Amino acid sequence: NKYLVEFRAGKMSLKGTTVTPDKRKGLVYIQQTDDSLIHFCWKDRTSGNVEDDLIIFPDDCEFKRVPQCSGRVYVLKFKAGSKRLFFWMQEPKTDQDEEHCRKVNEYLNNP
Amino acid sequence: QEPEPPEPFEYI
Amino acid sequence: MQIFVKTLTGKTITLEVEPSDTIENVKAKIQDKEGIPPDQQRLIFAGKQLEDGRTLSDYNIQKESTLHLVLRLRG
DSSP, X not given: OOOSEEEEEEEEEEETTEEEEXXXXXXXXXXXXXXXXXXXXXXXXXXXXXXXXXXXXXXXEEEEEOTTOOOOEEEEEEGGGSOEEEEEEOOSSSTTHHHHHHHHHHHHHOO | OOOOOOOXXXXX | OEEEEEEXXXXXXXXXXXXXXXXXXXXXXXXXXXXXXXXXXXXXXXTEEOOTTSBTGGGTOOTTOEEEEEESSOO
């Protein structure tokens, strides 16, 4: 039931070629359900609403920093850029940003 | 304290 | 068009489908090859559990795509 990885982060939305932040306080986390499937999730830290809940298998996606912004923007990108989910880090310090990125990739692509 | 949102940006 | 279905055990199944086929129809095609009842099948693509009454086109599933097949029992 415990989250395999978690970190505060907000969402962003891409329209045309412009990516704009959602202002909400949020939490990205990875969790294994009782049926052993791996879920990548985002929840509103204020309301508690789980707004994104994706079931991920190895080689579906990669989590990578977005140099275009540094605003600490990361994107979850599905195979052939079919889907992109953008996030901005909300941890007060940057010291774990890269390790959070490594752990996301590890648990999604080698759980 | 918690960071403010980044400014919008272009993604090509 | 041709799509592929890959199981958790790594088995690969090839199907002939149309963009307008429903997810339930895809599960029927898997039954015709593998003998698995559709109500025991979970199909997942790009993070989403595919809903039985929606079409492949609804999910923008294109030729040569691979769907993930997870059965409901035995992990």
